[PDB]
C-alpha cells in the first residue's frame, strides 16, 4: 500500500538528446512500457484484494 516508511522512490524517463526524424516521416510516436519481477522477487502474508467487490 502507499506507505512513507516503506516507500520505494521514483521512476522517470527523459530525453537524453532528442528524437530525430528525416523528412516524409511521422514526427510523433509512441513508446510502450512493461514491468516484471526479477528472480529474487517475493511476496508474503496472503490477503484479500481491493480490486474486486460484490456490493449486494
Amino acid at each position: 500500500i502507499d506507505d512513507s516508511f516503506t516507500e520505494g522512490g521514483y521512476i522517470s524517463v527523459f530525453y537524453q538528446t532528442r528524437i530525430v526524424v528525416p523528412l516524409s516521416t511521422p514526427r510523433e510516436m509512441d513508446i510502450l512500457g512493461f514491468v516484471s519481477a526479477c528472480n529474487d522477487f517475493s511476496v508474503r502474508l496472503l490477503r484479500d484484494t481491493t480490486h474486486i467487490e460484490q456490493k449486494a
Binding site: 526479477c38 528472480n39 529474487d40 517475493s42 511476496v43 496472503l46 480490486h51 474486486i52 467487490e53 460484490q54
Partner: protein
C-alpha cells in the same frame, strides 16, 4: 528438486563494465521477457538471500476457505399458510466473487474440495416462545437424483446420496470431496457450446448457451431443518466455505478487471472504467 520454501538466488557482487555484451538492450516483439537481474545493469554487492516464495506457491495461494453461498431455511409453526422452507443450491464458485477471481487467474484446474458449513439461527417474530436445538440435513443431490419437493418427502431418506446431519451449536460441519470432474481438469473457461445447431433442425432446437457445458455441472445441495414444526418460527442460515486442497493449475490469465456480471465473462454498461485519473508526469 527446487522447493517452494527454498531461498531465492544470491546477489553476486559485480563491478564496472565496458563491452559488446548488451543485456540492457532487447526486443519484446519476440514474445519474451528479458531475464535481467540487478548485476546486469548496475554495480552490485554480494548478498546472501534468505527470502523464499513459500507463500505464493499455488497451494498456499489457495489454502483458505472462501464463502461461496448462503442457504436459507426455516422451521415455522404448523399452522402457517406458507410452506416450511428448505433450501436448494446449485453447486458453484460463481455466486460469490472472491474465490472466483483467484481461480480465474488460471484457465484450468484440478483439486480436492474441502467444504465447511457454518450454521446460524435466530427468532423472527417478537414472541417469547422457545425452540429446542435444531438438527440440519445437508443432502448432496448429484445430477440425475430426485430433487426434494417438500421438506419431508421420500428423497431425504438418502440411501445413496451423501448427507450430513449437523447439530446446532457444535463445531461447523466438514467434508472432503475428490477431483470429481468428467474431464481431466476443471475448465474455468469453455469457449464453446453444448449443442451444434444443424440446418435441418429448427433454430430453437439447436440452441444452447454460450460458454456453458453440462447444464447441471455438479448437482445440488439441499438443506432442511429435520425438527418438526414449532409454534415459534426460527430461521437459519447455512454458510458454505470452499477450500481447494491438493491443487494444480494450468494456463495463466489476466485477472477480472471489471465487475462480474453473471456466470460468464459478460460485462455491464457503467462498470467498465476501473482505472483512475493520474497525470503522466505526476508521481
Amino acid at each position: 528438486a527446487a522447493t517452494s520454501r527454498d531461498a531465492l538466488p544470491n546477489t553476486e557482487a559485480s563491478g564496472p563494465t565496458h563491452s559488446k555484451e548488451i543485456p540492457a538492450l532487447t526486443a519484446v516483439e519476440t514474445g519474451a521477457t528479458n531475464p535481467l537481474v540487478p548485476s546486469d545493469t548496475v554495480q552490485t554487492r554480494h548478498v546472501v538471500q534468505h527470502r523464499s516464495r513459500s507463500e505464493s506457491s499455488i497451494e498456499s495461494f489457495f489454502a483458505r476457505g472462501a464463502c461461496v453461498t448462503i442457504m436459507t431455511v426455516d422451521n415455522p409453526a404448523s399452522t402457517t399458510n406458507k410452506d416450511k422452507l428448505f433450501a436448494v443450491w446449485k453447486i458453484t464458485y460463481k455466486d460469490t466473487v472472491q474465490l472466483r477471481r483467484k481461480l480465474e487467474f488460471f484457465t484450468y484446474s484440478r483439486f480436492d474440495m474441502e467444504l465447511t458449513f457454518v450454521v446460524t439461527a435466530n427468532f423472527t417474530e417478537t414472541n417469547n416462545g422457545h425452540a429446542l436445538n435444531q438438527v440440519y440435513q445437508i443432502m448432496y443431490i448429484p445430477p440425475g437424483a430426485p430433487v426434494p419437493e417438500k421438506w419431508d418427502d421420500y428423497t431425504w431418506q438418502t440411501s445413496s446420496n451423501p448427507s450430513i446431519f449437523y447439530t446446532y451449536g457444535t463445531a461447523p460441519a466438514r467434508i472432503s470431496v475428490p477431483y470429481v470432474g468428467i474431464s481431466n481438469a476443471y475448465s474455468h473457461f469453455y469457449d464453446g457450446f453444448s449443442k451444434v445447431p444443424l440446418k435441418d433442425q429448427s433454430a430453437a432446437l439447436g440452441d444452447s448457451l454460450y460458454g456453458a457445458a453440462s447444464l447441471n455441472d455438479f448437482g445440488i445441495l439441499a438443506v432442511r431443518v429435520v425438527n418438526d414444526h414449532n409454534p415459534t418460527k426460527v430461521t437459519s442460515k447455512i454458510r458454505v466455505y470452499l477450500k481447494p486442497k491438493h491443487i494444480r493449475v494450468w494456463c495463466p490469465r489476466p485477472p477480472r478487471a471489471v465487475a462480474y456480471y453473471g456466470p460468464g465473462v459478460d460485462y455491464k454498461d457503467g462498470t467498465l472504467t476501473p482505472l483512475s485519473t493520474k497525470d503522466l508526469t505526476t508521481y
